[PDB]
């Protein structure tokens, strides 16, 4: 329908002050989309919709998250890779925010940066995450985002993965999962599974721990495509008390690019349940309407 009509059903949801009527809205469509609705609103009613939305509904993530939803994608970003490294480095939020991104999204994000902090996000996040673990290179690797084509073969890049397992030529495995393009990972983990006597998500299990463990087993859940890192990421949200901060960021931020969240999680069980039950009355109703688990 007229994009015209759309900001209207908003208005009158925010009149409404129904949060859920308003995510639902949301959940209708893509961010493009969102971006669109989000003018024909402002002209319509001289307000910024994230604007009223703040303004009609009072509260926590629940509010923030609305907001987002209806604003830059990329300042959204630039903000929250800005308050993870605000204080002190905020891993849990580094995933969600470098890890669960498109390179074109991410590209934005950095330009984002610049415009609101007048500082080279990358450079910002060298300085305060250092060089000193495997998982601090792996990040400054995906941030830069050149995917380069891998030596043909599954199989034979299968098995030379395994052998860097082996050795622990930990060089070798952030150079491949930093440069290896998302395409070209599936077959070769298939592959590896298929032959190695251990899945790559153990492989990583027997070399990494830690903040170490996690980013690569965010990198491997991410080249297997976004919604299958989401499906995870909304899991750990589940087991970490309903984290709202970690289902913020990564909701407001990605929704409409992950919504196959849903089938993936079907290896940890049923979204819509979980939800329902790790994420309180206001936030969760919210939730399962934006993942589209009713
Ligand atoms: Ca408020
Ligand atoms: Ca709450």
Sequence with gaps: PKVTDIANELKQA?????????????????????????????????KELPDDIKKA???????????????????????????ALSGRNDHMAFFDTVILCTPEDWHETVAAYTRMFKKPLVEDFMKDVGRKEDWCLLMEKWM?????????????????????????????????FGTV?????????????????????????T?????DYYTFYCAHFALLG???????????????????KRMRRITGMMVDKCLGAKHAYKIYGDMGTDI???????????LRTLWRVK
């Design 207 to 211: 070399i990494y721990t830690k903040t």
């Design 226 to 244: 976004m919604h299958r890192l989401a499906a995870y990421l909304i899991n750990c949200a589940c087991n970490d008390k309903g984290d709202e």
């Design 14 to 46: 925010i009149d409404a002050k129904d949060e859920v009527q308003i995510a639902f809205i949301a959940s209708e469509y893509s961010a493009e989309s969102r971006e669109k609705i989000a003018k024909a609103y402002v002209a319509s009613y001289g």
């Design 144 to 176: 830069a985002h050149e995917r380069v084509s891998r030596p043909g073969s599954p199989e034979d890049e299968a098995q030379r993965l395994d052998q860097a397992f082996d050795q622990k030529n930990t060089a070798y495995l952030i150079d491949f």
């Design 57 to 83: 509904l009072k509260g926590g993530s629940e509010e923030s998250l609305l907001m987002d939803l209806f604003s830059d994608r990329h300042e959204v970003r630039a903000q929250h890779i800005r308050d």
């Design 181 to 205: 393009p998302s395409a070209e990972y599936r077959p070769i983990a298939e592959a590896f599974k298929a032959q190695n006597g251990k899945s790559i998500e153990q492989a990583i299990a």
């Design 276 to 286: 329902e039950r790790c994420f309180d009355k206001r936030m969760a109703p919210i």
